[PDB]
Amino acid sequence: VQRLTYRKRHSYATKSNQTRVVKTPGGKLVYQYTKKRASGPKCPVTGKKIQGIPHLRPTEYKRSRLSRNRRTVNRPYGGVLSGPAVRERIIRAFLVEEQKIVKKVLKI
Amino acid sequence: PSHKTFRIKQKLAKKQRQNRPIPYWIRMRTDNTIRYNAKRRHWRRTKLGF
Amino acid sequence: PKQIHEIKDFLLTARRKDARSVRIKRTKDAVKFKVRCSRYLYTLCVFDADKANKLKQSLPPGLSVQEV
């Protein structure tokens, strides 16, 4: 059944010391080390996930390592604000500006 | 330990070069009084303290 | 670790600088043409031996061909 062993000299079971059991061509079972999970990007306005972007460990998003279509969403404020938050900001920007005149209409 | 510093590795190396019996010809020199190495060390009997 | 799908572009990529070799692994049911480039090892799997022989000849003389 072949008990396993760590392959680094880090010997404690912290979150950084994550292992996966794999069966190699040599008939062996070994540990392999894995990433620790990251939450993905979030919209501050509603807290919800940002769509269209993978959930990776922050250096894994570097320009040299991930293609630009996986890093961006094609809308204003894209990948920073979700779609509904953009729609709300547009209407509020428009309406409040339209309210600025109708208060200035009162200046008589 | 396996993790050591270069400075500790350097001193441990010198301690090894000093655990050797004296050359036989030293015993033949004129007006000689050295009988044996009076400073030999064994890892299980005397610790280096460093 | 990067498979080619067509004889057309495989010829173009076996016709490159730093294409070091071409390996020919005759297998069951198929033949594999692997070209050793700088960054990647490209592979075609050919299914007609007639198209297999046709591919071999177009491999440009000089490009080290191994038969195993």
Binding site: - | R7, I8, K11, G49, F50 | -
Partner: protein, 80 residues
Amino acid sequence: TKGTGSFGKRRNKTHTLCIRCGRRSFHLQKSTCSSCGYPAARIRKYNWSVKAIRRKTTGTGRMRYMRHVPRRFKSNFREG
């Protein structure tokens, strides 16, 4: 308990080697040598231990440079 059970728990070094004097007297947390007083510029020595003084005064090492001053004083420090 104290004694044999408690002596089994020596695993952490209070002192290590000192760069200035070479003795295992550098207190890591306090970051000062208990023997020579490093990193204090002046050297730690007391008159209430004359024996500790004579273990480390001039002449107990090489005197790489001051060995030759007596010879240079005779001949009134001639420069060729």
